[PDB]
């Protein structure tokens, strides 16, 4: 057992780096899955804005606006409830803050070969009042956010009316869609970097366990699984000696 016990100490560093990279990838996949929902909701909001801009039936406008307001509330819910290990990911907790860096919070990941190079990652506010036409700075002026959409104003304003006409409110949705797409793409690049780290960690572990890194592909693993299964059946006493070496308190902990 002592041979196997020190093999733990050899690759303990690689295993914990592998767990950290897995945790980081799943955090990003959690954020990306929620952003996919927000993007889909924004696409539906655009359909309703376009429908409102072509409707001459104002109670139709009010019913369309009711749906839009419920959809932008869905966007707020996603930005407020999306979490990984209790950390709010999409509510602006981790947004960049170049105007006041003292207020900025970063997500930290470990990247590169050996998973020792730290990087900082930010995620912008994805709530409805933080998506839309941005000013020169990060700010969104009045009537320029997805939360400000109001298609009932189309009844009293021409399509080219500033801020509240059909063209301007449609532009708010287009900009918001691209903002969500940009945030998801930036997180995908980080995920790609963590994937490369995982594959270098695996190659490092493959080198340190030569003759236990022996299984290459599905064909070998399938064939070795059947061969090993039959050897366990045929050599029960050897199988017991080889593997039945767990201590009871470690088993209860692993089965939680």
């Amino acid at each position: 057992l002592a041979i196997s016990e020190k093999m733990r100490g050899q690759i303990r560093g690689l295993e914990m780096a592998s767990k950290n990279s897995q945790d980081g990838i799943s955090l990003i996949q959690t954020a990306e899955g929620a952003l996919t929902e927000t993007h889909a909701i924004l696409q539906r909001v655009r359909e309703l804005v376009v429908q409102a801009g072509n409707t001459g039936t104002a109670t139709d406008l009010q019913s369309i606006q009711d749906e839009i307001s419920a959809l932008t509330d869905e966007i707020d819910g996603i930005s407020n409830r999306t979490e990984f290990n209790g950390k709010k990911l999409l509510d602006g907790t981790y947004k960049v803050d170049t105007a006041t860096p003292a207020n900025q919070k970063n997500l930290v990941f470990q990247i590169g070969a050996n998973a020792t190079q730290q990087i900082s990652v930010n995620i912008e506010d994805m709530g409805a009042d933080a998506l839309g036409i941005k000013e020169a700075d990060g700010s969104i002026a009045a009537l320029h956010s997805v939360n400000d959409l109001d298609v009932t104003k189309f009844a009293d304003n021409a399509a080219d009316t500033a801020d509240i006409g059909f063209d301007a409110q449609l532009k708010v949705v287009d900009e918001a869609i691209n903002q969500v797409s940009s945030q998801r793409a930036k997180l995908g690049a980080v995920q790609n970097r963590l994937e490369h780290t995982i594959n270098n960690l695996s190659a490092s572990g493959e080198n340190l366990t030569a003759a236990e890194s022996r299984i290459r592909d599905v064909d070998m693993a399938k064939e070795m699984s059947e061969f090993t299964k039959n050897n366990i059946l045929s050599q029960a006493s050897q199988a017991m000696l080889a593997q039945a070496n767990q201590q009871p308190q470690n088993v209860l902990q692993l089965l939680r």
């Binding site: 057992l1 041979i3 196997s4 016990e5 093999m7 733990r8 295993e15 592998s18 767990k19 897995q22 945790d23 990838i25 799943s26 996949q29 959690t30 899955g33 979490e83 990984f84 290990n85 963590l194 994937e195 995982i198 695996s202 572990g205 493959e206 366990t209 003759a211 236990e212 890194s213 022996r214 299984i215 599905v218 693993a221 070795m224 699984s225 059947e226 061969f227 090993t228 299964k229 039959n230 050897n231 366990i232 059946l233 050599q235 029960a236 050897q238 199988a239 017991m240 000696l241 080889a242 593997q243 039945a244 070496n245 767990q246 009871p248 470690n250 088993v251 209860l252 692993l254 089965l255």
Partner: protein
């Protein structure tokens, strides 16, 4: 529960069964798009495979091929995690089922 009761062979069988349970839970989490749940269960499954590998008596000849399978199972579960690949999970589930079924027979006929 009543673990100090179990024989050494029965303890190992408990580990194989837990590994399968956590892989199945992670596959289900992938269908439900629950990334955190998938990640939690695959790491649980990986920890079991690593505990099995590190409790091998490598003076016994059988330990070489069992540990080589554990190494592939661990690497394959990591890939399935980051790729959301249920197909990969079904592959590793088949290996653990092989080990589980043979182990359960081994402690019986003994």
């Amino acid at each position: 529960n009543s673990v100090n009761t179990a024989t050494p062979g029965e303890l190992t069988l408990m580990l194989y069964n837990g590994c399968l349970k956590f892989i199945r839970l992670a596959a289900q989490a992938i269908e439900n798009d629950d990334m955190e749940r998938k990640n939690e269960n695959l790491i649980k499954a990986q920890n079991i495979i690593q505990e099995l590998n590190f409790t091998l008596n490598r003076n016994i000849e059988l330990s070489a091929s069992m540990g080589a399978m554990y190494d592939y199972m661990y690497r394959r579960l990591v890939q399935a995690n980051i790729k959301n690949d249920t197909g990969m999970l079904a592959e590793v589930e088949g290996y653990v089922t092989d080990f589980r079924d043979a182990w359960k027979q081994a402690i019986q006929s003994e």
